[PDB]
């Protein structure tokens with residue numbers, strides 16, 4: 201038996217990046233051992249500790265000594281804070297790598313998050329293969345690689361463009377729909393994003409959680425070799441498994457309800473833990489759901505701008521979101537819909553045969569989970585690159601419908617009802633379902649014993665073991 205080479209992972213964001221990073225590492229076990237070298241600006245969170253400690257033994261964690269970010273403006277976007285966090289943690293990253301190399305272990309590669317590219321300098325100085333793990337779309341990867349050119353050939357704010365931005369190999373996108381950090385070109389967020397995009401060519405490869413059957417255009421453009429463009433390895437869809445392949449067979453309460461409903465008849469509504477809606481926006485959605493004949497399963501959170509404090513609370517002690525719904529919504533909805541507070545077993549809901557639709561904020565892991573299990577989408581993007589994902593999902597793949605937002609930022613009930621009704625019982629909804637089932641089959645194929653994605657993973661492992 202050969203000694204497993206060691207690989208170090210530097211994440212820069214929260215769970216949306218840890219989950220796919222962990223899945224990537226699990227696919228490569230036990231050939232390698234892994235260390236999550238997590239930069240921090242304070243005591244690690246309980247969810248971080250719990251998620252990383254639940255991983256197989258070959259993946260351990262090191263929470264780097266926290267850096268001081270108090271000098272940054274309180275207006276600083278997360279991109280700026282992540283870049284500062286990684287840059288200031290690099291000496292501790294050297295120390296961690298030293299602890300491994302001084303014991304005789306071979307450090308084969310350094311896998312950096314999309315905002316941790318400054319750690320590539322460490323890898324280069326130590327003779328370690330630097331790779332970038334890209335937990336988003338090939339379309340967003342293409343945009344990153346083209347950001348330099350776009351920055352030089354456009355002076356105004358991108359929203360002010362009248363024509364849609366053309367990214368090599370992707371559907372056009374309006375400047376207003378481009379990622380959050382580029383909406384204020386004067387903010388440090390944009391300068392950091394630009395700085396990181398120019399460093400992708402320093403890596404030996406970019407590992408992207410997508411596949412050609414989902415993003416044909418961008419992936420074929422990216423695989424086409426050009427000098428100054430890194431190798432790209434499509435390995436998606438990397439997603440967690442369901443609780444069926446976990447352990448005890450105890451059934452959550454929402455899945456009991458889903459069994460009682462008929463096939464493909466429930467619209468799952470989940471904006472994610474960072475998708476709090478205003479009171480008005482949540483009232484517009486509730487009103488449509490109350491007057492609808494559609495069965496739904498809706499995860500709700502306390503709005504961000506309640507006129508008054510909370511009066512009701514849950515046993516744990518947090519604000520009770522259900523007592524904030526409109527008067528009589530719960531009685532009006534009983535039987536047809538089930539409202540859940542804060543969280544739900546998303547993957548298992550999407551794998552349920554009764555689930556027929558998914559109203560989502562278009563987080564890429566959620567998109568990938570919906571695609572793998574074949575649940576068509578209502579694309580309700582909110583922040584980060586979700587608007588880009590929505591354009592590609594609705595106007596490119598045509599596996600969802602996007603409700604138009606108003607001039608005040610509100611998606612009125614008319615648009616919510618339009619997309620719900622079309623998806624769940626219109627004629628376009630059947631064509632969208634057929635297409636999504638085709639992508640479901642393509643997603644299982646690339647993960648097959650000999651598929652596009654499994655071979656790309658094998659290529660990465662081979663490169664790491666080489667030389």
Ligand SMILES: O=c1ccn([C@@H]2O[C@H](COP(=O)(O)OP(=O)(O)O[C@H]3O[C@H](CO)[C@@H](O)[C@H](O)[C@H]3O)[C@@H](O)[C@H]2O)c(=O)[nH]1
Pocket residue numbers: 215216217219335336440470472473474499542543544545546547562563564565566567569583584585586
């Ligand atoms: O109530 C919930 C909410 C989430 N999840 C799971 O937690 C993950 C959430 O994934 P995702 O929707 O992608 O979370 P985000 O935090 O929104 O992802 C961030 O990171 C992604 C990768 O860059 C980007 O695509 C997103 O835009 C960005 O917001 C998934 O595995 C969910 O199945 C649950 O089980 N229950």
